[PDB]
Amino acid sequence: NPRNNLISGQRRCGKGRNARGIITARHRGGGHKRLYRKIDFRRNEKDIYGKIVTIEYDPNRNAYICLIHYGDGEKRYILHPRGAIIGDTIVSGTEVPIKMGNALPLTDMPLGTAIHNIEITLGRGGQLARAAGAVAKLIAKEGKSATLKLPSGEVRLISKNCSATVGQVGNVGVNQKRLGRAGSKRWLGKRPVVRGVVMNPVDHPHGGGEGRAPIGRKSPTTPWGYPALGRRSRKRNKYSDNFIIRR
Amino acid sequence: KVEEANISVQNLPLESKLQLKLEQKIKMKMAKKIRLRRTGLCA
Amino acid sequence: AVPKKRTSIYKKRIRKNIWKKKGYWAALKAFSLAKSLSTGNSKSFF
Amino acid sequence: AALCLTKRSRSRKSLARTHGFRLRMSTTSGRALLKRRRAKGRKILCTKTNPSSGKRA
RNA sequence: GAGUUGAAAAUAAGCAGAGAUCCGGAGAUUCCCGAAUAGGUCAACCUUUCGAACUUCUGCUGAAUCCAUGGGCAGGCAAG
RNA sequence: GUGAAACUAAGUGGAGGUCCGAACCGACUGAUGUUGAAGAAUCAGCGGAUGAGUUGUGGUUAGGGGUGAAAUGCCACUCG
RNA sequence: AGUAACGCAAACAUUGGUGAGAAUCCAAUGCCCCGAAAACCUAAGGGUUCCUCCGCAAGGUUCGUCCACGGAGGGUGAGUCAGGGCCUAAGAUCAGGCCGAAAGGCGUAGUCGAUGGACAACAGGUGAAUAUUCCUGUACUACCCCUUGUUGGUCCCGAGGGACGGAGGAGGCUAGGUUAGCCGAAAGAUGGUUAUCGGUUCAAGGACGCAAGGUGACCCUGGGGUAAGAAGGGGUAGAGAAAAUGCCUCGAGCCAAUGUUCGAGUACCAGGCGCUACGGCGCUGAAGUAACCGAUGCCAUACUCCCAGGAAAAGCUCGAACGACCUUCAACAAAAGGGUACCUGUACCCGAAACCGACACAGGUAGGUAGGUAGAGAAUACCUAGGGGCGCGAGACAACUCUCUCUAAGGAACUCGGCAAAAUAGCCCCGUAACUUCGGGAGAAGGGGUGCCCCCUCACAAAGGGGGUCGAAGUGACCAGGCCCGGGCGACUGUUUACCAAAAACACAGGUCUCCGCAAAGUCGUAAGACCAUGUAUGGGGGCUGACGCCUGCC
RNA sequence: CUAUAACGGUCCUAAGGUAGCGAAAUUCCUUGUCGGGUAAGUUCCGACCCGCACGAAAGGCGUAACGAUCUGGGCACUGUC
Known about the structure:
part of a larger assembly; 4 chains; A: mainly beta; CATH 2.40.50.140; 4-stranded antiparallel beta sheet; 3-stranded antiparallel beta sheet; globular; C: mainly alpha; 63% helix; RNA-binding; ribosome; Cryo-EM; chloro-ribosome; 50S ribosomal protein L2, chloroplastic; 50S ribosomal protein 5 alpha, chloroplastic
């Protein structure tokens, strides 16, 4: 039964190839209306037990999103953790039971647990590990931070007084489904990316030469000319909150 | 054949439009019919 | 396929004359048909 | 496939928006065009249609 | 100072020494689009309680600290 | 048929960038045509034909720019 | 040079007209052609071409009395059909706001913008050009006017709903055709005949209105029986309204096209009898029923199955700060009683001689209707309905070019290459290999029958079995696969040089590398800022290789 | 036996082509030798190898299916001859 009053309809027209009309992000188009669902991240309804009445399939996302009622007349879509079988009960709050899929400030929870959704900073909805299976361990806490290890194999102290959810987001099985038809990609809305050794020298710094030609440049470059391997691209000074790249 | 199906004038969007009108109007009819029938039961 | 050079007035007058004259020969025939169609025994022209 | 014929029976209304006088005037450049089309001395200085009946016999 | 109702000839009735036609100074009207201006608009259109927005003037006077304000509201005039 | 399946036949089921083939889309072979009927057709054949399909009405992107399943092709018969 | 040509190989022929002039105009009679159209509408476009009467200078690839050409008059009527007065998507413009030599850029509420959602008309007549516009009859919507009541409003507001994917086959049906009855007429000059010919129609709307499918509820079937629950309904618990809770409801039926009746005791009509400058009209006017099959309409966003998960906002229905205002300005059951009813389009073409290709161009142009025989079919072939005979003709019939048919004996010997021809071909039935990813190959290959008549069986609707007869030839016309064996490249379907290149080129499913911690990286913009992402590390950008199998050395 | 070198010495670079494949869409000389096919085949298939100048993601090798692909030989069918 679609139309939860919450599928909220109007997205931004199609996939956004355009800032001004220009293709400013290459090769997007085609697909369905992929009509979107305002799921909840600013969870923020504290100390109210909600049910779980559906693991609904979200096209605008990667992980099955589950619906939750409440005692009041309220409904939300929130990502569902691994093993949130139907008709269970989750609850945000502060001292909440540590238990799959219920959120609690990051200060008040045991280190080493599996935590999926977090806040880089208060008020925002939910930023880090948020895909379809992603997980982040807590390494030891600290004065006003929490040396949290997000899902890049990468550690980063993050501000202790920000919300987070427990458990890991579910639906890991997507990570390995094969798209054999070769035009299913097209259903998803991702246009074919033409390789660059063939574009003529006006189009790409991989100018055509008689016969197949191997680069010939000192280093492989993006169509815009920057090195396309190894060249780290981080502003020299931004925050420096994170302890290690671990990349 | 053809003339006998452009006597009763209903084609591309007007077949669809009058059809929708008749579904609509009978739907209001039955809405009144059962709206009354309920009182026909509970007394 | 394309002519080299225009012909003179001389030549052209020759051929136009042959054209018209070719029309000349085909009158006296019609004049015989006339001078015979002036009422007379004949099986033609109902 | 139609022979290299550039113009097809497109709606007059659609054409008017692209080259419509109302459209022509709003742009800074467009007002400039009117300047010239009047300094030369043209008479039919657009191609438009009208939401009543775009013709007088 | 006599004849006149624009171009070309009638046409139809007119007007004029109880100044016609006409020539000047000052006026009045100046449908619709167009700065375009009541609102929209594919210009010369549609819907309209009949009449922009910017200054200006006269009044009501948000916010937080009923402060003071600016902003808003309105009735104004008519100047870009 | 095995504390448990694993597989064999039947039936239902209806999948497939599946199959043959009209509309439709497009262009491969051949002849005609080449002061053409046509500034790329006609005829006989030909490929795809529920899909990475077509198409209608409104729109978007611009000149060292746009778009490009990439030919430097297309951008109103004009494009290194 | 009076030279090529006169725009496709549908095809004209006559008699009689009109006129100064007929192959070219009109009327017959005949022949012929399309008929998934060379037919009838309609969106766009054109914009006066439509109609009537004169005209023929130029135009028409001939002619001309004729025209889409010239001249003069004339013509297109809507409360319901389309749009606006209603709503909003992509997009556009954006007050204020931010940014910027100037212009101007980004951007919110607003305002426009339909190709979409709300919303009310059908049949028959008329006529030179209009008719769902005019006329007749019957309908529907909105606003008033009248009566009884309640006094309580309308807005802003918070809610329901509007609201919406693809296939896929069932099911019930209706339009439509047949076949039959029924009524009318009939000799149609050769054998015999009526076995032949025509009509057999009526919509919107009102009132009633139900078998299918959905309760697979306990099963035997698909109905008596007993209790909670289905469509609809009352609640109460966190104050109207859904949102959530639980109980419960003479609760078991609800859903929809068809159906009936009225609309239509009516018209309508084949056929009769007179007029006539041969059209026309006049009066009469019978029967107006059943069985078959069938939809690429209808129930229908039924239902099942899928992943790639399918627009919004108004109308419209319920009510809180029962919000400004209050039976004087108000609204509802309501007589379904009486009256009124806003702008714009409407002609004509529209698979086109008038639209787009400069030509009255053997091109192109969205959507709608879809008949008969044979057929699996919207192909094909021959025809109804309707429309047309292609706007230069008549002779002769050399060579030669093209579109085609046939060719004795050989059957690739031609040739750069069997290119181009020819040849198979449909439905049944037997059989089907190498390989293989074990799906495929595979319609492999190859072989056989099939026409009509009679007969009984298997469903006993088709098909098959037996027998017969005919031709040289039996899917016999049209339509309708040539097939193998071996290689190279590319895994495949797909896309590409509009107009000399369709490919081994590009792409793709897959692989690896590398960058990016979320006010990311990358791109665009001087800037604001916008894609990225309303995503968030199994996710984003970039480079090369391109299923699958084994691998991927050394510096 | 004669040859071809299983194996050795030298300058060299940073090292000196591994597996597979091979006269190959890469071999010029070159219709390279040999075998099959043909009456006769510079095309063709299978091999050898002195790879002029193949070779491992400007991938190596091989692959069932598919090709309006290029290529060789077939049977049927014919005015292509």
